[PDB]
Write an enzyme that holds these catalytic residues in place. Structure first.
Site, PDB file in Angstrom:
ATOM      1  N   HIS A  73      10.583  81.260 -10.007  1.00  0.00           N
ATOM      2  CA  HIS A  73      11.399  80.309 -11.069  1.00  0.00           C
ATOM      3  C   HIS A  73      10.968  80.574 -12.543  1.00  0.00           C
ATOM      4  O   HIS A  73      11.545  79.866 -13.096  1.00  0.00           O
ATOM      5  CB  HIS A  73      11.415  79.168 -10.468  1.00  0.00           C
ATOM      6  CG  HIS A  73      12.540  78.601  -9.690  1.00  0.00           C
ATOM      7  ND1 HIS A  73      13.766  78.267 -10.221  1.00  0.00           N
ATOM      8  CD2 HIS A  73      12.966  78.824  -8.444  1.00  0.00           C
ATOM      9  CE1 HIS A  73      14.751  78.149  -9.180  1.00  0.00           C
ATOM     10  NE2 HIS A  73      14.082  78.631  -8.142  1.00  0.00           N
ATOM     11  N   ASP A 137      12.445  68.059 -11.007  1.00  0.00           N
ATOM     12  CA  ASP A 137      13.810  68.024 -10.732  1.00  0.00           C
ATOM     13  C   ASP A 137      14.251  68.602  -9.676  1.00  0.00           C
ATOM     14  O   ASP A 137      15.186  68.354  -8.884  1.00  0.00           O
ATOM     15  CB  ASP A 137      14.417  68.255 -11.901  1.00  0.00           C
ATOM     16  CG  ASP A 137      14.130  67.577 -13.373  1.00  0.00           C
ATOM     17  OD1 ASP A 137      13.547  66.228 -13.050  1.00  0.00           O
ATOM     18  OD2 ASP A 137      14.515  67.790 -14.486  1.00  0.00           O
ATOM     19  N   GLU A 250      14.715  59.366 -16.834  1.00  0.00           N
ATOM     20  CA  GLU A 250      15.202  60.619 -17.454  1.00  0.00           C
ATOM     21  C   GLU A 250      16.420  60.024 -18.383  1.00  0.00           C
ATOM     22  O   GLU A 250      16.631  59.299 -18.395  1.00  0.00           O
ATOM     23  CB  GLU A 250      15.375  61.899 -16.770  1.00  0.00           C
ATOM     24  CG  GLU A 250      14.381  62.375 -15.832  1.00  0.00           C
ATOM     25  CD  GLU A 250      14.319  63.535 -15.164  1.00  0.00           C
ATOM     26  OE1 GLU A 250      13.408  64.071 -14.656  1.00  0.00           O
ATOM     27  OE2 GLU A 250      15.439  64.422 -15.616  1.00  0.00           O
TER      28      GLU A 250
END
Ligand SMILES: *[C]C1=C([C])[C]=C2N=[C@@]3(C(=[C])[C]/[C]=N/C4=C5[N][C]=NC5=N[C]=N4)C(=O)[N]C(=O)N=C3N([C][C]([O])[C]([O])[C]([O])[C]OP([O])(=O)OP([O])(=O)O[C][C]3O[C](N4[C]=NC5=C4N=[C]N=C5[N])[C]([O])[C]3[O])C2=[C]1
Ligand SMILES: *[C@@H]1O[C@H](CO)[C@@H](O[C@@H]2O[C@H](CO)[C@@H](O)[C@H](O)[C@H]2NC(C)=O)[C@H](O)[C@H]1NC(C)=O
Ligand SMILES: *[C@@H]1O[C@H](CO)[C@@H](O[C@H]2O[C@H](CO)[C@@H](O)[C@H](O)[C@H]2NC(C)=O)[C@H](O)[C@H]1NC(C)=O
Ligand SMILES: *[C@H]1O[C@H](CO)[C@@H](O[C@@H]2O[C@H](CO)[C@@H](O)[C@H](O)[C@H]2NC(C)=O)[C@H](O)[C@H]1NC(C)=O
Ligand SMILES: *[C@@H]1O[C@H](CO)[C@@H](O)[C@H](O)[C@H]1NC(C)=O
Ligand SMILES: *[C@H]1O[C@H](CO)[C@@H](O)[C@H](O)[C@H]1NC(C)=O
Length: 496
Positions: A73, A137, A250
């Site tokens: 990632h 997340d 958030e």
């Protein structure tokens, strides 16, 4: 000459040089940079990692850099090994036994192989009624990968990043030595590796702290047109009391030019909600809209529901979001945690997931967040069509251990700012890349002491400023100790 153990890996077909293998390990999620390795290692056990590293450590003139690919990632090749060897970490978990994830008998923690993906760590923990306390997340990332960075999400304000929730680890240094470390054993290695960007060794096991698993999460979004009220409320919700009742906090920024579209793409708001928010923006003549996203975890008790309502009503009463602009959803805890998976599947079918991701991730001190908002959200980003979330939320420095490798601003409160731009349109990537340099340049000129995250620098002076001179000297010391040959994770471009 090849060491017996290294040659053995070749025979068993663990070392692949075929274009199929090397090609797969030559690209990452960023989809911007690429680099072919000389070979790819598919280890079946930690013993194979020792063999590779011991070989490199004992072989004079060894010219092969080594990287550990979790799930790739990375955004700018941090997991590549140009002309070197890429370790396919997932191979460590192919064997049906022994298990790579083991919840402690007392239910106080969970052992997980460095290659395991958090989504599985979660499933294995929930089976035993517990679950990690700090997340990212997105759950399809490896334990070793997020721990090599920091691992942050809406829980970090009260539990700290994932690197603050590790009791101990098993690490194989650049010398090929297997070492177990923690705050009380080989602390030097423990601190260096956490947020260490894979420069000191590979994480084969991490002991992660857990808490009793909540059953559900009351999920809410609050809307603002005033940044001052928005940030003040996020700070209030995440301020030390001990912490407020919110389990996650958030925030999101929606630029006016693409407001309706971005609100709809949240997957949270209904079309009716969207219409009301678009009208609100027009009424206030706002060029930007802000939304706080928060949750309250709770169990399946008989009084839970009514209790959550009361708790929420109380908390919301202390806030200043626009009257009547509070939106709630109630879901199972695991459903909330894996919320982004749904976005991936969707976008991927439309061919909008595997596209260039010129993401900009940084920490901005609280004292300059309002200036950042004016210069970036209300400035640089105006006049463009934005596809992708613009995430902003406060963090408490008290939950970060500066002894570890992760670097953060000096202020007690600083914001995680993640501008997740997607080059969905054609070659719109050049525009986005220039825009990020402009944002960074704006911050430099305004004197904002930010820290980049998930980014790699191609210039030595930049890495020194990133860590800080004193912390940098420490980083180098730990480098000469655990990987003096400068072979690990060369993609970070720190010592390579
Ligand atoms: C791709 C991705 C995604 C999708 C996501 C994510 N997430 C995060 C952020 C940034 C944010 C985002 N968000 C989002 C959202 N929201 C809403 N919606 C949405 N969408 C989208 N997105 C979070 O959350 N947080 C954080 O913190 N982070 C993140 N991320 C990033 C990550 O973490 C990274 O990338 C890491 O790296 C991990 O991954 P992986 O894959 O696992 O890994 P890699 O890449 O392969 O690698 C890296 C590095 O490290 C090292 N290693 C590995 N492994 C190991 C190591 N070392 C040692 N040991 C071991 N075991 C290598 O070598 C390199 O250098 C994200 C993303
Ligand atoms: C509604 O908001 C817009 C944008 O914030 C205001 O328009 C700006 O007005 C200033 C001052 O006249 C100009 O310097 C800007 O160039 C305008 N924005 C752009 C780039 O179009 C507008 O004045 C606001 N409505 C009112 C009059 O209150
Ligand atoms: C917000 O963005 C919209 C574009 O989506 C702007 O467009 C509106 O105003 C234009 C100028 O008069 C009109 O030509 C558009 O038809 C109209 N579109 C909409 C939103 O219905 C809008 O002015 C922008 N508002 C601000 C505060 O910048
Ligand atoms: C979690 O616990 C299991 C059970 O003890 C561990 O399994 C052993 O793994 C080693 C090598 O990793 C083997 O040599 C043993 O034979 C395994 N035990 C068994 C089932 O006989 C596992 O390694 C641990 N992993 C974690 C999560 O840290
Ligand atoms: C980017 O992704 C596309 C689609 O998978 C692929 O064809 C291309 O080679 C990738 N480019 C890079 C730099 O990885
Ligand atoms: C509580 O009950 C809900 C609904 O039946 C269920 O989804 C959840 O897993 C339960 N929690 C426990 C005790 O595991």
């Amino acid at each position: 000459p090849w060491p017996a153990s290294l040659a053995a890996l070749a025979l068993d077909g663990k070392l692949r040089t075929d274009s199929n293998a090397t090609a797969a390990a030559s690209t990452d999620f960023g989809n911007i940079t690429s680099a072919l390795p000389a070979a790819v290692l598919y280890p079946s056990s930690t013993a194979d990692l020792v063999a590779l590293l011991s070989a490199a450590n004992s072989t004079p003139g060894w010219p092969y850099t080594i990287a550990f690919r979790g799930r790739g990632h990375s955004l700018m090749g941090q997991a590549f090994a140009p002309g070197g060897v890429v370790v396919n970490m997932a191979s460590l978990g192919d064997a049906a036994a022994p298990p790579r994830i083991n919840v402690s008998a007392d239910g106080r923690y969970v052992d997980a192989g460095g290659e395991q993906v958090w989504i599985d760590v979660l499933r294995a923990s929930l089976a035993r009624g517990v679950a990690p306390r700090s997340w990212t997340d997105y759950l399809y990332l490896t334990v070793g990968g997020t721990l090599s960075n920091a691992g942050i999400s809406g829980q970090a304000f009260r539990h700290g990043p994932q690197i603050s929730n590790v009791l101990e680890m098993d690490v194989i240094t650049g010398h090929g030595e297997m070492v177990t470390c923690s705050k009380q054993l080989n602390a030097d290695l423990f601190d260096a590796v956490l947020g260490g960007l894979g420069q000191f060794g590979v994480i084969t096991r991490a002991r992660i702290a857990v808490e009793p698993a909540p059953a559900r999460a009351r999920w809410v979004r609050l809307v603002y047109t005033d940044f001052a009220a928005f940030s003040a409320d996020q700070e209030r919700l995440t301020a030390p009391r001990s912490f407020g009742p919110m389990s996650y906090v958030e925030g999101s920024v929606f630029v006016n030019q693409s407001l309706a579209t971005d609100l709809a793409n949240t997957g949270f708001f209904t079309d009716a909600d969207v219409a009301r928010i678009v009208a609100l923006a027009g009424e206030r003549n706002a060029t930007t809209v802000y939304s706080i996203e928060a949750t309250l975890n709770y169990d399946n008790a008989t009084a839970a529901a009514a209790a959550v309502d009361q708790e929420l009503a109380s908390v919301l009463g202390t806030l200043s979001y626009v009257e009547g602009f509070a939106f709630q959803r109630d879901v199972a805890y695991a459903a909330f945690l894996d919320r982004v998976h749904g976005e991936e599947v969707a976008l991927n079918k439309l061919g909008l997931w595997r596209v260039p991701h010129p993401w900009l991730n940084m920490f901005v001190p609280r004292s300059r967040i309002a200036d950042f908002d004016r210069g970036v959200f209300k400035g640089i980003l105006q006049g463009t069509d934005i596809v992708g979330p613009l995430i902003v939320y406060p963090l408490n420095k008290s939950m970060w251990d500066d002894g570890m490798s992760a670097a953060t601003p000096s202020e007690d409160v600083f914001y995680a700012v993640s501008l997740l731009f997607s080059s969905v349109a054609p070659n719109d990537l050049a525009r986005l890349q220039e825009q990020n340099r402009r944002i960074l340049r704006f911050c430099d000129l305004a004197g904002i002491q930010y820290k980049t995250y998930l980014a790699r620098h191609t210039d030595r002076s930049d890495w020194v400023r990133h860590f800080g001179a004193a912390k940098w000297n420490r980083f180098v010391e730990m480098k000469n100790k655990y990987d003096p040959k400068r072979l690990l994770s060369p993609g970070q471009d720190i010592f390579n």
